[PDB]
Ligand binder design. Structure first.
Ligand SMILES: *[C@@H]1O[C@H](CO[C@@H]2O[C@@H](C)[C@@H](O)[C@@H](O)[C@@H]2O)[C@@H](O[C@@H]2O[C@H](CO)[C@@H](O[C@@H]3O[C@H](CO[C@H]4O[C@H](CO)[C@@H](O)[C@H](O)[C@@H]4O)[C@@H](O)[C@H](O)[C@@H]3O)[C@H](O)[C@H]2NC(C)=O)[C@H](O)[C@H]1NC(C)=O
Ligand SMILES: *[C@@H]1O[C@H](CO)[C@@H](O)[C@H](O)[C@H]1NC(C)=O
Ligand SMILES: *[C@@H]1O[C@H](CO)[C@@H](O)[C@H](O)[C@H]1NC(C)=O
Ligand SMILES: *[C@@H]1O[C@H](CO)[C@@H](O)[C@H](O)[C@H]1NC(C)=O
Ligand SMILES: *[C@@H]1O[C@H](CO)[C@@H](O)[C@H](O)[C@H]1NC(C)=O
Ligand SMILES: *[C@@H]1O[C@H](CO)[C@@H](O)[C@H](O)[C@H]1NC(C)=O
Ligand SMILES: *[C@@H]1O[C@H](CO)[C@@H](O)[C@H](O)[C@H]1NC(C)=O
Lengths: 341, 244, 114, 69, 120, 120
């Protein structure tokens, strides 16, 4: 493993996401329709942190990330996913297809700066110890070249309900210094069946630098209206929560809005504090005199004790292990301590 | 299996890419409980699922009733929570002759106290001392300072409600993805241009099958109309696109 | 083997004597106790160690110097600043519960000749 | 009483002409809303108030209309 | 304060039956995890059984199951043991031992054996 | 392949107790319906008991209930018998007999007693 330190330490740079980050949200074919879907999408015009030099620190992974690279000599190698990424938790390793396209969810002991090296490959310095393999998948062998732009590669990495979902798109590009304006959707590439807790990630690169840069954005729950063309290709989209015109477009289920007045949503002031007020009673309720009683009544002549003017702490009675039945009607047994009678 | 998991730390085996013959499991006489939610137990062999999870643990006889949607109790709340929209079958059988020991088998543990209820299919395998009161415990047991786990004392002389039961929960997931687990159904020849009753990898209806001119992408298995009803299917054996 | 405990050990005055009472795989998650038996007298409780921590005790005729730690499947009793009063037989036991007390498998015991 | 609320109406020329919009918070006082114009329907933000009257294009309410000029 | 004392020492011919008492003075009786233990002369302690008086159930070791009878008399706040078919190896000092109780009392949360008997 | 063999012949004076083993070699043990049968010299066979090792339960005939103890040791893949209070009429050859199992294994679907012991 090699720790790359010959890095200028500058704050993150930012660029404009424009209309990037749209992927096919589902596996159903539709055409000549506008479909509204609520999912994790990259927001339009979202600010996107921009990395190059040898730029690759550890980044947060929140709901999911958008990854895109603009490269001329295929420097990106893969991604590291995990929680600690130091064999304390399960981790995911995706190597380049040069050896093989491979996702190994084995338990690896990783380096504090994993990478692959190259122009020919020699070093493999990604991890040291590796045992407790639980999942493996290997794609048919290929090869990732180890040595304005022309080739654009887009990736979306999600970890939802037991699936690690990878989406990708291959397109022509023509910007020197930015993400293009125009539209493309990322088709799903492979569905990985791994029920993994992913919160942190690191980028693998292949000392000298190649011509490459990469971008990381973050996904949020948003509603998008997607336009499917005659061939079932997604050709446009509106992020309806970006601004009121996109909101109007989402409400009217159309990308064209006529002159007029539209009722599109409802504004609401949100509460900022939680105000809880209960009486100044401190005496405890006399439940103990009935539950630990030594002289229970007969059922034909059952006893009744009335309990009043006291504080009823039900976490002691509910959290007791000594009762075999605790069935509640009209109230739930686990919310009982928040009520007054 | 000979090494079932504890309920506080239950095992999960994922089953995929196979033919699931449920007439052997359903028609077995060896199970005492086979209650299904979301599906019927006698039509299970005609269905296809994306993937099936088989969760397994040992619980107390009186506690078999808690392994169901909408239940409360120490196990349902702190060990294994099943969701209310669960699709699957809960299988349990008496295992006193395997899991019980004369002096008592204490290798089966359950969580007794927890700060909050579990979410569906959440696991908690920590051994943090449970805080019952307001005074910090600093890692020490005592009153209001409790150890969260406890064992079931399984003995051959216990009553039926206190005997060990082995429970296997089969969770059936239905999401828009390739199906990998299907019942033991035989396939017939494909018929086009005729009024037929079809079952395409679980998609059922009545209609006439014709050749489609839709350009499906390699990952799309079926289509829907503006009405969001099925109107196109990719055949599961030959990767041909049909309009329905 | 159940509770495995060394037959005898010998430590010098003012030193550290770590005593290992190992827990078997079948008897892994069991409470562990520690007792001091003077020669010819009844054993008395010293400290109790659980799998999650220390049970906690005081005022049982036990010097403050005595301490117990539990790591993994091995339970360690540590004696610091030992003098001639500590020469005795020490026993560690197992335990279980949920309404029937089960049994305590007592190890062989340790004869710490100072 | 509940916290201040109200509907949001978007005042706009069509997308054939411009993507600039104005938002009407109906019957909500200007202050609690967050070119701010107070009117009977509420405070309308993004439209410039002028004293020159014209034919109604986009109606606001209570005598106020809006247009793109 | 709380202490447990039993009857004196008995000597019996082999093949007979021995009954050993255990008196309890102080504290809240019937919540204690009363236990019976023994140690052979020159050998480590060996368990034989235990009893919780409130639950009225008795547990025994496999070596002594079917040969040791243990009962707890709540009225006198005492615990009794009956051991039959004594052999040559069975001679030893016999101890009556208790445990503090805390928690739900139906599930095992107990302290150590702080208090012991004087022998038998 | 699969066969069951036991220990040799024992002679006991009346009023004693006799313990007879039964070793199992080959096959998947603890699924077999191990049975114990006897035949008096010059008389037809008489049943006394049977046991299924996996279920850990033993059944006995009314003539021998309370006098015959049968256990199955899964660890050694062996089946044991204990018979007490032997009388003059109780002398006979003793056979250990098995049955193939098929089906759910909780409900009786068994083959015949294809394999037998060599006597006792
Ligand atoms: C049912 O009853 C038990 C026993 O209580 C007795 O019986 C009832 C009917 C009344 O007559 C009581 O007056 C009797 O005492 C109750 O368990 C007790 O709970 C209380 C709290 O509600 C405990 O009081 C605590 O004591 C802590 C210190 O004691 C600790 O150490 C001792 C040994 O020295 C140990 O025996 C004890 O268990 C503790 O570990 C103290 O730190 C804390 O602040 C509090 O004062 C009391 O000790 C408990 N007794 C026992 C033996 O468990 C049940 O609460 C009661 N249940 C109901 C629902 O009524
Ligand atoms: C991984 O394997 C090693 C060696 O068998 C073992 O010691 C360790 O406990 C295993 N860990 C897991 C996660 O099972
Ligand atoms: C997931 O990882 C994070 C890392 O901070 C951790 O806090 C969280 O408890 C983990 N959750 C699960 C369910 O493992
Ligand atoms: C759709 O596909 C057809 C045939 O391949 C092609 O002629 C056409 O240009 C494509 N684009 C659309 C959306 O019409
Ligand atoms: C089985 O299915 C595959 C596609 O997965 C197809 O190529 C092959 O011809 C089919 N074979 C049979 C037996 O029909
Ligand atoms: C709106 O709030 C301001 C500040 O409190 C107040 O002066 C004004 O009169 C209010 N207007 C209405 C319409 O209530
Ligand atoms: C418009 O009317 C307002 C109110 O009478 C006045 O203050 C302002 O000077 C006038 N002129 C314009 C065009 O703003």
């Amino acid at each position: 493993c090699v720790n790359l330190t010959t890095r200028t330490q500058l704050p993150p740079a930012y660029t404009n996401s424009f209309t990037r980050g749209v992927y096919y949200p589902d596996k159903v074919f539709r055409s000549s329709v506008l479909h509204s879907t609520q999912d994790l999408f990259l927001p339009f015009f979202s600010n996107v942190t921009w990395f190059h030099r040898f730029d690759n620190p550890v980044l947060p992974f929140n709901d999911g990330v958008y990854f895109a690279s603009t490269e001329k000599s295929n420097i990106i190698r893969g991604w590291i996913f995990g929680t600690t990424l130091d064999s304390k938790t399960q981790s995911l390793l995706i190597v380049n297809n040069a050896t093989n396209v491979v996702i190994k969810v084995c338990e690896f002991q990783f380096c504090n700066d994993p990478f692959l090296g190259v122009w020919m490959e020699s070093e493999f310095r990604v991890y040291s110890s590796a045992n407790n393999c639980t999942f493996e998948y290997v794609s048919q062998p290929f090869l990732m070249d180890l040595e304005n732009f022309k080739n654009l590669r887009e990736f979306v990495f999600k970890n939802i309900d037991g699936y690690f979902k990878i989406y990708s798109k291959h397109t022509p590009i023509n910007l020197v210094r930015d993400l293009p304006q125009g539209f493309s959707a990322l088709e799903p590439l492979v569905d990985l069946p791994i029920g993994i807790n992913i919160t942190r990630f690191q980028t693998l690169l292949a000392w000298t630098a190649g011509a490459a840069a990469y971008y990381v954005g973050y996904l949020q729950p948003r509603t998008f209206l997607l336009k499917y063309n005659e061939n079932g290709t997604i050709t446009d989209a509106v992020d309806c929560a970006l601004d009121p015109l996109s909101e109007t477009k989402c409400t009217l289920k159309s990308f064209t809005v006529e002159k007029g007045i539209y009722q599109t949503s409802n504004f609401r002031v949100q509460p900022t504090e939680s105000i809880v007020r209960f009486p100044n009673i401190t005496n405890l309720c006399p439940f103990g005199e009935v539950f630990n009683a030594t002289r229970f009544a007969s059922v034909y002549a059952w006893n009744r004790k009335r309990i009043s003017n006291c504080v009823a702490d039900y976490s002691v009675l509910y959290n007791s292990a000594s009762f075999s039945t605790f069935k509640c009607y009209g109230v739930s047994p686990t919310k009982l301590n928040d009520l007054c009678f | 299996a000979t090494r079932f998991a504890s309920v506080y730390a239950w095992n999960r085996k994922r089953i995929s890419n196979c033919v699931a013959d449920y007439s052997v499991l359903y028609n077995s006489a060896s199970f005492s409980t086979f209650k299904c939610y979301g599906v019927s137990p006698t039509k299970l062999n005609d269905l296809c699922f994306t993937n099936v999870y088989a969760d397994s643990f040992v619980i107390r006889g009186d506690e078999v009733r808690q392994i169901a949607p909408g239940q409360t109790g120490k196990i349902a709340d702190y060990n294994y929570k099943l969701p209310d929209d669960f699709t699957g079958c809960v299988i349990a059988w008496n295992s006193n002759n395997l899991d019980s020991k004369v002096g008592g088998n204490y290798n089966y543990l359950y969580r007794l106290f927890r700060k909050s209820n579990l979410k569906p299919f959440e696991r908690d395998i920590s051994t943090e001392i449970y805080q019952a009161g307001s005074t910090p415990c600093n890692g020490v047991e005592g009153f209001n300072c409790y150890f969260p786990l406890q064992s079931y004392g399984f003995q051959p002389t216990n009553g039926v409600g206190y005997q060990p039961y082995r429970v296997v929960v089969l969770s059936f997931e239905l999401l828009h993805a390739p199906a990998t687990v299907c019942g033991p159904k035989k396939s017939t020849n494909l018929v086009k241009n005729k009024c037929v009753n079809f079952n395409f990898n679980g998609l059922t209806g009545t209609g006439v099958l014709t050749e489609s001119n839709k350009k499906f992408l390699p990952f799309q298995q079926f289509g829907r109309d503006i009405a969001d009803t099925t109107d196109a299917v990719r055949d599961p054996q030959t990767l041909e696109i049909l309009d329905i | 083997s159940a509770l495995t405990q060394p037959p005898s050990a010998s430590a010098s005055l003012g030193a550290s004597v770590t005593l290992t009472c190992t827990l078997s795989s079948g008897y892994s998650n069991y409470k562990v106790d520690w007792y001091q038996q003077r020669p010819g007298k009844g054993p008395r409780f010293v400290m109790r160690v659980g799998t999650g921590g220390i049970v906690g005790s005081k005022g049982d005729g036990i010097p403050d110097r005595f301490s117990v730690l539990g790591s993994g499947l091995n339970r360690y009793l540590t004696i610091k600043n030992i003098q001639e009063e500590d020469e005795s037989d020490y026993h560690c036991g197992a335990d279980q519960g949920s309404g029937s007390n089960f049994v305590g498998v007592f190890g062989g015991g340790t004869k710490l000749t100072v | 009483t509940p916290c201040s609320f109200g509907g949001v109406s978007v005042i706009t020329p069509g997308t054939n002409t411009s993507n600039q919009v104005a938002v009407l918070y109906q019957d909500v006082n200007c202050t609690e809303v967050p070119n701010v114009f107070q009117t009977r329907a509420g405070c309308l933000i993004g439209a410039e108030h002028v004293n020159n009257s014209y034919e109604c294009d986009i109606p606001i309410g209570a005598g106020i209309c809006a247009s793109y000029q | 304060q709380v202490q447990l004392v039993q009857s004196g020492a008995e000597v019996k011919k082999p093949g007979s039956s021995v009954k050993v008492s255990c008196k309890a003075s102080g504290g809240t009786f019937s919540s204690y995890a009363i236990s019976w233990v023994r140690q052979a002369p020159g050998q480590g302690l060996e368990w034989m059984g235990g009893i919780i008086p409130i639950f009225g159930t008795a547990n025994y070791a496999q070596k002594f199951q079917g040969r040791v009878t243990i009962t707890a008399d709540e009225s006198t706040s005492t615990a009794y043991m009956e051991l039959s078919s004594l052999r040559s190896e069975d001679t030893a000092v016999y101890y009556c031992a208790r445990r503090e109780a805390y928690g739900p009392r139906d599930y095992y949360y107990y302290y150590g054996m702080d208090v012991w008997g004087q022998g038998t």
